[PDB]
Scaffold this active site. Structure first.
Site, PDB file in Angstrom:
ATOM      1  N   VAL A  92       0.813  -1.227   0.000  1.00  0.00           N
ATOM      2  CA  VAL A  92       0.000   0.000   0.000  1.00  0.00           C
ATOM      3  C   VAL A  92       0.846   1.277   0.000  1.00  0.00           C
ATOM      4  CG1 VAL A  92      -1.941  -1.135   1.137  1.00  0.00           C
ATOM      5  CG2 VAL A  92      -0.191   0.034   2.540  1.00  0.00           C
ATOM      6  N   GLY A  93       2.165   1.142   0.158  1.00  0.00           N
ATOM      7  CA  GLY A  93       3.070   2.292   0.252  1.00  0.00           C
ATOM      8  C   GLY A  93       4.423   1.971  -0.344  1.00  0.00           C
ATOM      9  N   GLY A 122       8.049   4.270  -1.066  1.00  0.00           N
ATOM     10  CA  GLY A 122       8.685   5.561  -0.829  1.00  0.00           C
ATOM     11  C   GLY A 122      10.173   5.457  -0.600  1.00  0.00           C
ATOM     12  N   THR A 123      10.756   6.568  -0.159  1.00  0.00           N
ATOM     13  CA  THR A 123      12.188   6.658   0.099  1.00  0.00           C
ATOM     14  C   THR A 123      12.618   5.778   1.292  1.00  0.00           C
ATOM     15  OG1 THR A 123      11.737   8.764   1.250  1.00  0.00           O
ATOM     16  CG2 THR A 123      12.560   8.900  -1.001  1.00  0.00           C
ATOM     17  N   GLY A 140      11.116   2.958   2.494  1.00  0.00           N
ATOM     18  CA  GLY A 140      10.810   1.536   2.386  1.00  0.00           C
ATOM     19  C   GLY A 140       9.524   1.207   1.659  1.00  0.00           C
ATOM     20  N   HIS A 141       9.036   0.000   1.921  1.00  0.00           N
ATOM     21  CA  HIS A 141       7.787  -0.504   1.380  1.00  0.00           C
ATOM     22  C   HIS A 141       6.864  -0.824   2.546  1.00  0.00           C
ATOM     23  CE1 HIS A 141       9.424  -0.568  -2.570  1.00  0.00           C
ATOM     24  NE2 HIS A 141      10.299  -1.528  -2.326  1.00  0.00           N
ATOM     25  N   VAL A 142       5.586  -0.453   2.429  1.00  0.00           N
ATOM     26  CA  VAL A 142       4.582  -0.718   3.463  1.00  0.00           C
ATOM     27  C   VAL A 142       3.512  -1.654   2.906  1.00  0.00           C
ATOM     28  CG1 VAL A 142       2.793   0.285   4.943  1.00  0.00           C
ATOM     29  CG2 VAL A 142       4.976   1.431   4.675  1.00  0.00           C
ATOM     30  N   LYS A 152       6.360  -2.628   7.505  1.00  0.00           N
ATOM     31  CA  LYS A 152       7.303  -1.815   6.743  1.00  0.00           C
ATOM     32  C   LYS A 152       8.610  -2.571   6.571  1.00  0.00           C
ATOM     33  CE  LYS A 152       9.781   2.618   6.790  1.00  0.00           C
ATOM     34  NZ  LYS A 152      10.172   3.803   7.581  1.00  0.00           N
ATOM     35  N   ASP A 170       8.483  17.131   8.661  1.00  0.00           N
ATOM     36  CA  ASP A 170       7.785  16.922   7.376  1.00  0.00           C
ATOM     37  C   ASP A 170       6.294  16.676   7.564  1.00  0.00           C
ATOM     38  OD1 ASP A 170       7.634  16.846   4.553  1.00  0.00           O
ATOM     39  OD2 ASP A 170       8.074  14.715   4.440  1.00  0.00           O
TER      40      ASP A 170
HETATM   41  C1  LIG Z   1      14.004   7.046   8.890  1.00  0.00           C
HETATM   42  C2  LIG Z   1      12.745   7.260   9.705  1.00  0.00           C
HETATM   43  C3  LIG Z   1      11.496   7.081   9.116  1.00  0.00           C
HETATM   44  C4  LIG Z   1      10.341   7.274   9.864  1.00  0.00           C
HETATM   45  C5  LIG Z   1      10.436   7.588  11.227  1.00  0.00           C
HETATM   46  N1  LIG Z   1       9.238   7.883  12.013  1.00  0.00           N
HETATM   47  N2  LIG Z   1       9.126   8.924  12.692  1.00  0.00           N
HETATM   48  C6  LIG Z   1       7.901   8.954  13.223  1.00  0.00           C
HETATM   49  C7  LIG Z   1       7.418  10.069  14.141  1.00  0.00           C
HETATM   50  C8  LIG Z   1       5.942  10.340  13.899  1.00  0.00           C
HETATM   51  C9  LIG Z   1       7.625   9.623  15.585  1.00  0.00           C
HETATM   52  C10 LIG Z   1       8.221  11.356  13.899  1.00  0.00           C
HETATM   53  C11 LIG Z   1       7.174   7.831  12.821  1.00  0.00           C
HETATM   54  C12 LIG Z   1       8.085   7.154  12.035  1.00  0.00           C
HETATM   55  N3  LIG Z   1       7.858   5.979  11.247  1.00  0.00           N
HETATM   56  C13 LIG Z   1       6.672   5.709  10.562  1.00  0.00           C
HETATM   57  O1  LIG Z   1       5.683   6.390  10.722  1.00  0.00           O
HETATM   58  N4  LIG Z   1       6.619   4.565   9.757  1.00  0.00           N
HETATM   59  C14 LIG Z   1       5.430   4.285   8.931  1.00  0.00           C
HETATM   60  C15 LIG Z   1       4.295   3.626   9.681  1.00  0.00           C
HETATM   61  C16 LIG Z   1       3.405   2.894   8.641  1.00  0.00           C
HETATM   62  N5  LIG Z   1       1.967   3.014   8.926  1.00  0.00           N
HETATM   63  C17 LIG Z   1       1.579   2.203  10.094  1.00  0.00           C
HETATM   64  C18 LIG Z   1       0.058   2.291  10.266  1.00  0.00           C
HETATM   65  O2  LIG Z   1      -0.636   1.887   9.076  1.00  0.00           O
HETATM   66  C19 LIG Z   1      -0.313   2.693   7.952  1.00  0.00           C
HETATM   67  C20 LIG Z   1       1.201   2.619   7.713  1.00  0.00           C
HETATM   68  C21 LIG Z   1      11.688   7.809  11.798  1.00  0.00           C
HETATM   69  C22 LIG Z   1      12.841   7.627  11.044  1.00  0.00           C
END
Ligand SMILES: Cc1ccc(-n2nc(C(C)(C)C)cc2NC(=O)NCCCN2CCOCC2)cc1
Ligand code: NA
Lengths: 334, 267
Positions: A29-30, A32-33, A35-37, A54, A148
């Site tokens: 479903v995702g 991007g830069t 990864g893959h979700v 992910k 972001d």
């Molecule tokens: C390199 C990196 C990348 C992302 C993060 N990060 N940071 C955050 C905050 C909100 C705490 C700032 C959340 C995430 N990861 C993330 O949302 N991942 C995606 C969650 C996927 N969803 C889960 C629920 O269902 C829809 C998809 C940190 C560092």
């Protein structure tokens, strides 16, 4: 190499593997830069809930993987996406993160209302903003800057025990500058809490009108057209409104490219009136405190949460959908 | 300010990685079949010094070295010394700590050249052969380390609360250099696995006050903390210096290292 055999085979025997526990093949479903979700179901079916998996881009423990794991392992708040489990796959050195699946997000929710033209219900708008502020306040209190914020990163839980609960996430990306504070566009070197607040101000405007307030065509930190759009909406800042604008690295580029007389008739009041938000509304007065051009004059997330807008009828609800039927389509596969 | 700075009481460090002393000593019995109690605490000193040397060679700040040291300690708190070579584990912990503390990915050539140079120039008394591991070993070891720690990466240390205490005293110039040095020395022991960092900071500050003959009794009395716990920590610190005096690391370590349990090879 030189690793005790009994230790190794015991861990191998016990190590849970993502492919054994979850069905996700063909369920992306995702992309991007970062990864893959995938939207995943548990194979050992003691559970019918949807899970998000992910697969982090690359192999091993990159700076990105390490940052995401280190932070999410500590963070615990109802309005921040919660890491459930990490799978380390030894055969390919891939890292997988497990989350409870969030069906909805503000990008899709706003697009639905923008296409039907039904504005977003005003109770829902307020409840969304309150929970966004609640999650960012928690992050900011822990010196975690989002960096972001935009509708696609504001997830909302669908049917289930967290129905209508906002989850702040970071999905990644090529790029729009519609939610970027003017100091970034003028070359500011550092991310700040105020930069997150401006983005929240942008999301709030967009919830109220269904249109991105600083929408701009596609184009160094300097972005002329994005700034032009901001001035068309807000007016050009007076010296007294943003005294340290002169210290921005691109201030002289701004002076070369722009003339304040171009934006004399421009104001947020006027913009929001065109989209039928009244300038004497508590909504408008809060929005204006978030969309303040000088970052040192933007209110904080805490102050925003204390705003009298959240005490005005109707009160924000825990389920942003207010117990009502959810008309938004489920997220589609890529 | 640093990410998660005020969150210790809801941290993974606090909730999962403050261990019970009896649990620690029970798991240690595995290795005490091969090594005496004395020899085990000598090995801990030795590998503390190896990690410090590796960190210094790579120009990492003390907090990165401290985090790497905690990762090492957490691993062998659970597992035998034979499970993964501590010679491999030590640079792996430094490599992971550097990423977590946001200094970056130490390059393949630099990590392996640092490991090789440090063992050769600073530990030839213990290691007559060259550092035998390559980056693929480090990368494999990193996966095992992360798994054993249950992905608990953010670590709290006594340096920050110490700095806050000495500033509050109004005695930063007089006391901070010694108290900071004593905090470094506590990593020779199990203390970081057993007590919250602020308690360790208070104990180190107390010992610095006694050493410099500074009366801080009233300031200590005005704190709201379990002084019985602080005294337990002070006793370990005072003992670590007597152990230091009596330990000839350079003369003893080669023999102690040869007594470490060796891994089973594949069949
Ligand atoms: C390199 C990196 C990348 C992302 C993060 N990060 N940071 C955050 C905050 C909100 C705490 C700032 C959340 C995430 N990861 C993330 O949302 N991942 C995606 C969650 C996927 N969803 C889960 C629920 O269902 C829809 C998809 C940190 C560092
Ligand atoms: Na909060």
């Amino acid at each position: 190499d030189k690793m005790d055999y009994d230790f190794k085979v015991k861990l191998s025997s016990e190590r849970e593997r993502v492919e054994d526990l979850f069905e996700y093949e063909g369920c992306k479903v995702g992309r991007g830069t970062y990864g893959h979700v995938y939207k995943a179901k548990r194979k050992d079916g003691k559970d019918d809930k949807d899970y998000a998996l992910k697969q982090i881009e690359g192999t091993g423990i990159s700076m990105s993987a390490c940052r995401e794991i280190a932070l999410l392992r500590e963070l615990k708040h109802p309005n921040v996406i919660s890491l459930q489990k990490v799978f380390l796959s030894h055969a390919d050195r891939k890292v997988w993160l497990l989350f409870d699946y969030a069906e909805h997000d503000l990008w899709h929710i706003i697009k639905f209302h923008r296409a039907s033209k039904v504005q977003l219900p005003r109770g829902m708008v307020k409840s969304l903003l309150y929970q966004i502020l609640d999650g960012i306040h928690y992050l900011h209190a822990n010196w975690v800057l989002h960096r972001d914020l935009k509708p696609a990163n504001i997830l909302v839980m669908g049917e289930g025990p967290e129905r209508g609960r906002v989850k702040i996430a970071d999905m990644g990306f090529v790029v729009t500058f519609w939610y970027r504070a003017p100091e970034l566009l003028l070359g500011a070197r550092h991310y700040t809490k105020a930069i997150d607040i401006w983005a929240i101000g942008c999301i709030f405007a967009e919830l109220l009108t269904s249109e991105p307030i600083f929408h701009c065509r596609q184009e160094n930190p300097y972005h002329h057209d994005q700034l032009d759009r901001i001035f068309n909406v807000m007016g050009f800042p007076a010296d007294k409104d943003w005294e340290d604008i002169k210290k921005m690295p691109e201030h002289s580029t701004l002076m070369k490219d722009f003339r304040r007389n171009t934006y004399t008739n421009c104001s947020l009041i006027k913009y929001m009136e065109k989209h039928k938000v009244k300038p004497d509304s508590k909504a408008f007065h809060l929005l204006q405190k978030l969309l303040t051009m000088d970052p040192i004059k933007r209110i904080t997330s805490e102050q925003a949460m204390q705003d009298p807008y959240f005490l005005e009828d109707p009160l924000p609800t825990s389920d942003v959908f207010a117990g009502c039927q959810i008309p938004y389509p489920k997220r589609e596969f890529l | 300010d640093k990410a998660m700075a005020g969150n210790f009481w809801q941290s993974s460090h606090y909730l999962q990685w403050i261990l019970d002393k009896q649990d620690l000593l029970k798991e240690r019995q595995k290795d005490l079949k091969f090594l005496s109690e004395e020899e085990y605490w000598k090995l801990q000193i030795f590998f503390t010094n190896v990690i410090q040397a590796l960190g210094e060679h790579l120009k990492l700040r003390q907090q990165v070295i401290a985090t790497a040291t905690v990762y090492f300690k957490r691993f062998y708190a659970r597992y035998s010394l034979k499970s993964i070579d501590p010679v491999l584990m030590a640079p792996t912990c430094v490599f992971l700590a550097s990423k977590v503390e946001e200094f970056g990915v130490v390059s393949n050539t630099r990590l392996i050249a640092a490991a090789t140079s440090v063992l050769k120039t600073r530990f030839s008394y213990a290691f007559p052969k060259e550092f035998p591991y390559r980056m693929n070993h480090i990368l494999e070891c990193e996966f095992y380390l992360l798994e054993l720690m249950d992905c608990c990466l953010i670590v709290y240390h006594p340096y920050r609360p110490l700095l806050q205490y000495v500033q509050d005293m109004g005695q930063e110039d007089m006391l901070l250099p010694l108290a900071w040095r004593i905090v470094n020395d506590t990593y020779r022991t199990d203390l970081c696995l057993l007590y919250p960092p602020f308690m360790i900071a208070l104990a180190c500050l107390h010992v610095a006050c006694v050493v410099q003959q500074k009366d801080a009794r009233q300031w200590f009395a005005e704190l709201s903390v379990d002084m019985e716990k602080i005294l337990e920590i002070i006793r370990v610190i005072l003992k670590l210096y007597e152990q230091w005096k009596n330990f000839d690391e350079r003369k003893e370590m080669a023999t102690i290292l040869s007594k470490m349990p060796k891994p089973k090879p594949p069949p």
